[PDB]
RNA sequence: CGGCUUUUCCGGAGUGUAAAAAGCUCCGGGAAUAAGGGCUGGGCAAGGCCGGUGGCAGCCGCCGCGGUAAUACCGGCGGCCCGAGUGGUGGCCACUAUUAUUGGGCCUAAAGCGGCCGUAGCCGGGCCCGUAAGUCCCUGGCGAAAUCCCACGGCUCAACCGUGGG
């Protein structure tokens, strides 16, 4: 069955990137998936995006620029304070600041560098580089 | 709580490269034991570890300890006065060994041979700031670098000591 | 499938699974149940003291052919009897019947058989509180 | 240095261009070496590369990593044959690895070195470690992985003057690549020296595969080849 | 030490910079004869259609 | 030569306590009587009222620290200070 | 060959003792006056000639050496590592991602139940509204000392101790 749209969508995206396909659709469209996708779009790894209703859950269409090397989902929602980010980054990012992490804090889901800026911890969600 | 050694043994005491580099540095400095060279490298490694942690640290305490690190390493006379945290990682064991009392007093031309300098050190014919010492492994600090002189009470203070002229002509010649 | 469980609210089965499968290995099981020290003739003693009974030589396992000398010793701590190899060139000449001796492990893999001599587990160090190595070298004299 | 320039001149005299890569290097229409790799032609004459990389001629820049005495069983005797693995390379980010069959040690060595010469690849270097961050090619720019046979090798940036943290085969090959500080993690059996060397080679080749955002070049002082 | 920064070629069909020893290809445009279209080995094997930036022409 | 650093006064007990230094470069460490007879000169003290606590010559040095103490009356050490220090300085058999 | 200080050793002067002792600290006479352990075929790499034993004696963690010339046993030479420590044994962590959350595999190397059903457990579709238990940031109390990290100061330096900060 389906237990999390986000991980499957990120895996699908990465796979399509390996074959270098140009346009991708994510079937289970949610608000959270849209917000996270906007979040890394802010940093340029993906280009335009759109939502299209289908009368069931909407679909999310993206065109890929093929500059991502791996976009995975951190399933077990590890909560982390401000200080320990470097501990987790070493676990998922290849090098210093190489890409981002996605954290849901009290204000929402946004990048991890910006999270360090505002100094607000939260739940690790996904990573992409 | 038990007092621990301040030096670390190599991971493999019969690798040719490290053994021969040690041998070279031993004949270029004539330290009695590899224990001493290992100790100096231990000091180096501790400085580097502190530097790496601090580079990997964020907080007012991190900055304060960084300042303390820079201040001390400069005080020892190991780095230029504009040194930053970056350049310490490029430090070498020879930097530390130069700062040794034996090396400094030998470069000050008070001995034909650095082993002769060591003999003077143990025999307390040498003084610092008007205080005698007997430890050739001492890493002297910068602000005392001009105060290393012959012990006032030693016969070597007399410029007519039979060795002293040989020292002086070897210095010139 | 994916190595499971991994749920945020599932640590119990994780540690259960881990602890269960720990029992598969052997060394940790040996430590906890204290099997070695309830089968140890020496009771974890780095050395033991005993009395000599007889001298026998054993045939080296093939392809090594040799008469490795050794002795039978009953130790004083409990009264069990064991075999002890005697290292040294002409070593056996020094050792006699009814000799107080000191014995320790031989250093084979997992303290077991050492190379080409099977069954033996121990070597002698001091006889009558006198080290055997110098006796082999003849520097010292047996009492 | 002038020794290697004159070496390049005399080999230019002696060697005659054969393939469609020979003329533009003999004619001087190609002088930078990376013009070979960027366009990605095929390299088939060894004499090409030493015209632009006479540094390969150095005794130190060539290394024989492994020597093996393989056997073939026949009805009429065990025919031996030496397989030797050797690594050549300039000390500024260009290396090649080669294997040579042979009936004697010298011929095996020569063929292996030639095949290494035919196997030059271009690397990147930088400083992406978590402490050093000195924007200098003292280490690999970012964590990299390479796989071959059973061996999987992950090379992670380290700080300056750490030393090069890898098994001896990796030690030599990375020394020949102009990289001197790195952490290493090894999966699979590392007693198979050939597989280990080739996996390290593959990781180094993989270094160029990662897409890099433009700012990262200056963030790490990413050097493409020579410094 | 003048910084000799070079312009690593990029495959139009994927945008990925070309690794050194890849068997990629380059060629002037087939339609407008000005654009130096690159094609990377990955883009070559599966042969996805590539787009000329200038004339808009598409080519397997 | 003898050079003083501290003269301070505990008036609750009536003692002037004194920390000083003896510069004796190249000669053996001085004894108590001679340094006592020296100190008593330029401080204007009664020797019978004065007791030297300690003298300590550091390793590899020609300047030795010294602490001495002088009260007002004879009863003060008989009631406060202990017999043995009077014994060492000779005020008591 | 010629000469140079005298580590330790003899005498004296102080701390020292509530009682010496403590040989600590300063001066004087003053010797060139103390050095081993293990290894030497390869994993280790770290290092070759000779005399003898001839699978007898023995060596050896493991691989393995000698059955008549042993570079691998024994003796000598020469050499390699460390050094007032070196060697053997036994116990624990690493090596080992040979316990695997980070991070182990299960067709052929040990490893999927013969198959289906299902309870507790674990993990669960999308959207709106409200809470804020978990979640995160600020703030009070609290998690002693000793031990740990850093600067400075005292003991010649250090180890040790103090002041300050973590």
**Residue-range domain boundaries for chain B:** 13-170
Tokens in use for B28? 């270029």
Residue in B105, B107, B131 with CA at minimum distance from that of residue B119 = B105
Distance CA D20, CA D26 (A): 11
Q: Do D205 and E16 touch (CB under 8 A)?
A: no
Q: Residue B60 to residues B52, B54, B82, D75, F2: CA-CA distances in angstroms?
A: 16, 11, 21, 79, 49
> Which residues lie below 8 Å from residue D143, measured CB to CB, with a gap of 6+?
A94, A95, D128, D154, D155, D156, D157
Q: From the centroid of its chain, how far is CA C30?
A: 16
Q: Do D40 and E1 touch (CB under 8 A)?
A: no
Q: Is the distance between the Cβ of B19 and the closest atom of strand G smaller than 7 Å?
A: yes
List beta partners, residue A105: A108
**Nucleotide nearest residue B156, measured CA to C1':** G5
Whether chain A lies against chain F with 3 or more Cβ pairs closer than 8 A is no
According to DSSP, residue D94 is labeled: E
Tokens in use for A66? 């093929």
Tokens in use for D1? 């240095």
**Measured CA D133 to C1' G139 distance, in angstroms:** 37
List beta partners, residue A61: A25, A50
Using a CB-CB cut-off of 8 Å, the residues of chain B touching D135 are none
Please count the other Cβ atoms lying within 10 Å of the Cβ belonging to residue B27: 9
Q: Do D40 and E8 touch (CB under 8 A)?
A: no
According to DSSP, residue D57 is labeled: G
| F28 interfacial to chain B (CB closer than 8 Å) | no
| B91 interfacial to chain F (CB closer than 8 Å) | no
List beta partners, residue C72: C54, C83
Could you tell me if residue D49 is left (phi over 0), alpha (psi between -120 and 50 degrees) or otherwise beta?
Answer: alpha
Is the distance from CB of A88 to CB of A101 less than 8 angstroms?
yes
Tokens in use for E49? 């259609």
Q: Is the distance between the Cβ of C140 and the closest atom of strand G smaller than 7 Å?
A: no
Tokens in use for C91? 């070593």
Residue in E29, E36, E33 with CA at minimum distance from that of residue E58 = E29
Q: Residue E55 to residues B153, E9, E15, E34, E59: CA-CA distances in angstroms?
A: 95, 20, 19, 9, 12
Using alpha carbons only, how large is chain E's radius of gyration in Å? 13
Distance CA A47, CA A23 (A): 11
Distance CA F72, CA D173 (A): 86
Label residues B41-66 b or e (16+ Cβ within 10 Å = b). beebeebbebbbebbeeeeeeeeeeb
Shortest distance between the Cα of D131 and any Cα of chain B, in A, equals 5
Distance CA A67, CA A89 (A): 20
Is the distance from CB of F29 to CB of F57 less than 8 angstroms?
yes
Is the distance from CB of F80 to CB of F13 less than 8 angstroms?
yes
Cα torsion F83, F85, F90, F91 to 10°: value is: -50
Burial class (CB in 10 A: 0-12, 13-18, 19+), B2: exposed
Is the distance from CB of A104 to CB of A122 less than 8 angstroms?
yes
Domain locations in chain C as residue ranges: 1-143
Is residue E50 helix, strand or coil?
strand
Task: Measure CA of the first residue to CA of the last residue in chain F; give whole Å.
Answer: 30
The strands making up B126-128's β-sheet, listed across from edge to edge, are B131-132, B126-128, B148-150
Q: Do D130 and A90 touch (CB under 8 A)?
A: yes
Whether chain A lies against chain E with 3 or more Cβ pairs closer than 8 A is yes
**For chain G, which bases have at least one atom within 7 A of a protein Cβ?**
3-7, 11-20, 24-28, 32, 44-47, 55-67, 73-75, 80-84, 88-92, 97-105, 112, 121-128, 134-138, 146-152, 155-160, 165-166
Q: Is the distance between the Cβ of A123 and the closest atom of strand G smaller than 7 Å?
A: yes
Q: Do E6 and D227 touch (CB under 8 A)?
A: no
Residue in D140, D121, D113, D116 with CA at minimum distance from that of residue D129 = D140
Q: From the centroid of its chain, how far is CA C61?
A: 19
Using a CB-CB cut-off of 8 Å, the residues of chain D touching B86 are 134
> Which residues lie below 8 Å from residue D144, measured CB to CB, with a gap of 6+?
A94, D154, D155, D203, D204, D206, D207, D210
Distance CA F82, CA F86 (A): 7
Using a CB-CB cut-off of 8 Å, the residues of chain F touching B153 are 25-26, 62
Tokens in use for B45? 């490694």
| E53 interfacial to chain D (CB closer than 8 Å) | no
Phi, psi of A20 (to 5 degrees): 70, 20
Distance CA A73, CA A75 (A): 6
**Which residue does chain D place closest to A65, by CA atoms?**
D211
Residue in C84, C81, C50, C79 with CA at minimum distance from that of residue C69 = C84
Evaluate the CA torsion angle A95, A98, A99, A104 in order and state its sign. Answer: positive
Q: Which approach determined this entry? A: cryo-EM
List beta partners, residue D88: D62, D96
């Amino acid at each position: 069955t389906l237990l999390d749209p986000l991980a499957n969508a990120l895996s699908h995206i990465t796979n399509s990137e390996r074959v270098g396909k140009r346009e991708v659709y994510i079937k289970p469209a949610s608000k959270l998936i849209g917000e996270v996708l906007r979040v890394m779009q802010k940093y340029g790894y993906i280009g335009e995006f759109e939502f299209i209703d289908d009368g069931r859950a909407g679909v999310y269409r993206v065109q890929l620029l093929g500059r991502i090397n791996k976009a995975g989902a951190i399933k077990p929602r590890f909560p982390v304070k401000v200080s320990e980010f470097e501990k987790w980054e070493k676990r998922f990012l290849p090098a210093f600041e190489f890409g981002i992490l996605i954290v849901s804090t009290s204000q929402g889901v946004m990048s991890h560098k910006e999270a360090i800026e505002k100094g607000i911890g939260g739940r690790l969600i996904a990573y992409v580089y | 709580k038990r007092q621990r050694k301040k030096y670390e043994t190599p991971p493999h005491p019969w690798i040719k490269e490290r053994l021969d580099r040690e041998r070279v540095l031993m004949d270029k400095y004539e330290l009695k034991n590899k224990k001493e060279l290992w100790k100096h490298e231990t000091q180096l490694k501790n400085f580097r570890r502190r530097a790496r942690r601090l580079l990997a640290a964020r907080g007012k305490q991190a900055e304060i300890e960084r300042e303390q690190l820079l201040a001390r390493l400069k005080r020892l006379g190991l780095l230029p006065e504009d040194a930053v945290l970056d350049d310490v990682l490029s430090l070498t064991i020879e930097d530390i060994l130069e700062r040794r009392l034996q090396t400094i007093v030998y470069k000050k031309g008070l001995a034909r041979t650095m082993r002769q300098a060591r003999q003077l050190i143990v025999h307390g014919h040498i003084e610092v700031n008007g205080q005698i010492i007997r430890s050739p492994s001492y890493l002297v600090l910068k602000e005392e670098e001009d105060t290393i002189t012959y012990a006032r009470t030693s016969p070597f203070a007399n410029p007519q000591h039979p060795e002293r002229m040989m020292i002086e002509k070897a210095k010139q010649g | 499938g994916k190595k499971a469980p991994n749920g945020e609210f599932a640590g119990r089965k994780l540690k259960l699974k881990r602890k269960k499968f720990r029992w598969s290995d052997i060394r940790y099981k040996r430590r906890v149940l204290r099997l070695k020290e309830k089968s140890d003739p020496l009771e974890g003693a780095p050395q033991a003291r005993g009395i000599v009974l007889e001298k026998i030589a054993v045939e080296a396992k093939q392809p090594n052919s040799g008469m490795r000398k050794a002795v039978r010793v009953q130790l004083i701590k409990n009264g069990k009897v064991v075999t002890a190899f005697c290292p040294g060139d002409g070593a056996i000449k020094f050792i006699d019947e009814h000799d107080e001796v000191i014995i320790e492990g031989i250093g084979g893999p997992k303290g077991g058989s050492m190379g080409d001599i099977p069954g033996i587990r121990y070597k002698v160090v001091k006889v009558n509180r006198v080290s055997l190595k110098e006796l082999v070298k003849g520097r010292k004299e047996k009492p | 240095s002038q020794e290697w320039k004159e070496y390049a001149k005399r080999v230019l005299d002696e060697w005659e261009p054969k393939t469609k890569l020979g003329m533009m290097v003999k004619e001087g229409q190609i002088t930078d070496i990376h013009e070979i790799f960027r366009r990605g032609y095929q390299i088939k004459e060894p004499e090409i590369i030493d015209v632009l990389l006479p540094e390969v001629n150095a005794r130190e820049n060539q290394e024989v990593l492994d020597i093996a005495l393989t056997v073939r069983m026949t009805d009429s005797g065990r025919r031996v044959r030496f397989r030797v693995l050797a690594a050549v390379g300039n000390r500024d980010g260009y290396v090649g690895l080669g294997i040579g069959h042979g009936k004697e040690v010298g011929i095996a060595i020569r063929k292996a070195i030639n095949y290494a010469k035919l196997n030059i690849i271009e690397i990147k270097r930088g400083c992406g470690s978590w402490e050093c961050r000195c924007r200098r090619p003292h280490s690999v720019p970012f964590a990299v992985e390479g796989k071959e046979g059973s061996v999987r090798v992950r090379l992670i940036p380290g700080p300056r003057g750490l030393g090069l943290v890898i098994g001896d085969v990796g030690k030599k090959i990375l020394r020949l690549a102009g990289v001197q500080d790195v952490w290493s993690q090894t999966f699979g059996e590392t007693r198979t020296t050939v597989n280990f060397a080739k996996a390290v080679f593959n990781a180094l080749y993989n270094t160029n595969r990662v897409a890099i955002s433009p700012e990262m070049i200056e963030r790490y002082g990413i050097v493409v080849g020579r410094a | 030490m003048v910084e000799m920064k070079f312009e690593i070629p990029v495959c139009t069909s994927c945008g990925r910079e070309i690794t050194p020893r890849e068997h990629a290809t380059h060629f002037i445009c087939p339609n407008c004869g000005e654009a130096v279209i690159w094609r990377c080995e990955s883009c070559r094997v599966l042969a996805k259609p590539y787009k000329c930036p200038n004339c808009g022409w598409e080519g397997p | 030569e003898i050079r003083i650093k501290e003269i301070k006064e505990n008036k609750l007990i009536g003692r002037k306590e004194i920390y000083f230094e003896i510069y004796h470069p190249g000669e053996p460490t001085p004894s108590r009587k001679d340094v006592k007879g020296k100190l008593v000169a330029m401080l204007d003290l009664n020797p019978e009222t004065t007791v030297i606590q300690y003298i300590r010559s550091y390793f590899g040095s020609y300047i030795s620290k010294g602490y001495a103490k002088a009260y007002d009356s004879k009863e003060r050490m008989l009631y406060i200070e202990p017999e043995y220090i009077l014994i060492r300085d000779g005020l008591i058999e």
